[PDB]
Ligand binder design. Structure first.
Ligand SMILES: CN1C/C=C/CCCCN2C[C@@]3(CCCc4cc(Cl)ccc43)COc3ccc(cc32)[C@@](O)(C(=O)O)CC1=O
Length: 156
């Protein structure tokens, strides 16, 4: 059993679907639900900011990718490997990978290709986990992600 993969897929899939549909999935998480819940809540906060802070660049890359159908969505794995995997690994770049994923998912909703969203989530998860497992494990996986982005309450 690959717990890191399963957890990654659940978090990434949920975020992409919630971003596309604008509705929260009410179903419980699987194993390690408390961490997966906090991870999804962290992506909500941080992912939305990345999409807005890099709006122009996001729009430019989307137009360059020219995503119309299932076969274009399939071709994105190669591009993710090219851009994400072949560079420095840090939580910021992982958030961009997943946030751009959400950006693509919303686009797939707009062109009425919602069925490609879960395959896309699987592709993103494959790239993240299968190319960066060592780093992810060393950084404490999703617990580490949550701890990295944790914000202390302000006084007063
Ligand atoms: C906030 N930014 C700048 C934004 C640039 C807009 C273009 C985004 C290109 N992609 C988007 C990326 C490459 C394009 C296809 C694709 C498809 C899906 Cl479904 C998810 C991600 C991607 C790979 O993920 C990236 C990871 C890190 C970076 C860029 C990535 C970058 O770190 C990088 O270029 O190395 C850039 C980054 O983090």
């Amino acid at each position: 059993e690959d717990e890191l993969y399963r957890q990654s897929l659940e978090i990434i899939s949920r975020y992409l679907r919630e971003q596309a549909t604008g509705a929260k999935d009410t179903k419980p998480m699987g194993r390690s639900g408390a961490t997966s819940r906090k991870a999804l809540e962290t992506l909500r906060r941080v992912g939305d900011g990345v999409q807005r802070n890099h709006e122009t660049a996001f729009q430019g890359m989307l137009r360059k990718l020219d995503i119309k159908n299932e076969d274009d969505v399939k071709s994105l794995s190669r591009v993710m490997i090219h851009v994400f995997s072949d560079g420095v690994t840090n939580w910021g770049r992982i958030v961009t990978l997943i946030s751009f994923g959400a950006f693509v998912a919303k686009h797939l909703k707009t062109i009425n290709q919602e069925s490609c969203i879960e395959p896309l989530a699987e592709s993103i998860t494959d790239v993240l986990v299968r190319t960066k497992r060592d780093w992810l494990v060393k950084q404490r996986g999703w617990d580490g992600f949550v701890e990295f982005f944790h914000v202390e309450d302000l006084e007063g």
